[PDB]
Write a protein that binds this ligand. Sequence first.
Ligand SMILES: Nc1ncnc2c1ncn2[C@@H]1O[C@H](COP(=O)(O)O)[C@@H](O)[C@H]1O
Ligand SMILES: *[C@@H]1O[C@H](CO)[C@@H](O)[C@H](O)[C@H]1NC(C)=O
Ligand SMILES: *[C@@H]1O[C@H](CO)[C@@H](O)[C@H](O)[C@H]1NC(C)=O
Ligand SMILES: [Ca+2]
Ligand SMILES: [Ca+2]
Ligand SMILES: [Ca+2]
Ligand code: NA
Ligand code: NA
Ligand SMILES: [Zn+2]
Ligand SMILES: [Zn+2]
Ligand SMILES: [Zn+2]
Length: 267
Amino acid sequence: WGNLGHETVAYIAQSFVASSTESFCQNILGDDSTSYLANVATWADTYKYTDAGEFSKPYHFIDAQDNPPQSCGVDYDRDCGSAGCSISAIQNYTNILLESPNGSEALNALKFVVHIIGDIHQPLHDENLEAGGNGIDVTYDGETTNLHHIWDTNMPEEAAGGYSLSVAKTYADLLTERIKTGTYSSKKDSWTDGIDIKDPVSTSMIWAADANTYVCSTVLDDGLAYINSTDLSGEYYDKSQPVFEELIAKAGYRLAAWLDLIASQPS
Ligand SMILES: Nc1ncnc2c1ncn2[C@@H]1O[C@H](COP(=O)(O)O)[C@@H](O)[C@H]1O
Ligand SMILES: *[C@@H]1O[C@H](CO)[C@@H](O)[C@H](O)[C@H]1NC(C)=O
Ligand SMILES: *[C@@H]1O[C@H](CO)[C@@H](O)[C@H](O)[C@H]1NC(C)=O
Ligand SMILES: [Ca+2]
Ligand SMILES: [Ca+2]
Ligand SMILES: [Ca+2]
Ligand code: NA
Ligand code: NA
Ligand SMILES: [Zn+2]
Ligand SMILES: [Zn+2]
Ligand SMILES: [Zn+2]
């Protein structure tokens, strides 16, 4: 996701973490503001464009080598790669926070977890094709862009009504209510099925696999003829909105559950 997406996920997590988890995190981050997670949710995206952080570029995604929209699937051993991926990163950085939450590495580890759990839920971050669709040019609201970009940025920002931190906060509130009492409230207790602090690879693979199903059902199900030749701000946006909104919600809720486990469970 772009910035609004990451901040939204983070504000959602803030609304579900236990009070003791909130403490734990605030302490690591040196920030007790009401935006403590949201304030760090985009950091990894800066860092990957620096010399020092170049190594972390692969940690944003897992390039699933499947055949959408006919066949979707992710496989850790097949798809992670020699430089690492989102899944291996969640393993590493979770372990750092489990075993060395007061070491020098904890602060970045936590910032990475916050960001990467968000990225795992962007379906095109779990797809190899055309570099997660970056190489697929599209039209959106009369302008040329690419498919990855409209998922990261144009569509969620249109849905939210903007792109700043304050807009992220309002969008997070909308989606948080959907989890607590609204249209996601009867499904959300299944969203944490299979979660296991002692098997970060399995756990993050569940999430990556879940998001990847939407590559087939939603992102590319219209086919490339339609994707290449229509303005995707019409019916395509209408079809995609309930999916990206649910996935952002899942990311925030799963992030909260994960942080709660980090702040409380043994290795
Ligand atoms: N699923 C993805 N989501 C976002 N960026 C990606 C994805 N897959 C590859 N990329 C980026 O696209 C570029 C080329 O990808 P590759 O040919 O897999 O090395 C690299 O800079 C990758 O970081
Ligand atoms: C684990 O984290 C350290 C600290 O950022 C990093 O330098 C190392 O490359 C990481 N390894 C993996 C496999 O994520
Ligand atoms: C759609 O465009 C992509 C490149 O952006 C190309 O790979 C693909 O073959 C095109 N498909 C059709 C049916 O035009
Ligand atoms: Ca942006
Ligand atoms: Ca139910
Ligand atoms: Ca359950
Ligand atoms: Na790759
Ligand atoms: Na611990
Ligand atoms: Zn992102
Ligand atoms: Zn992206
Ligand atoms: Zn990212």
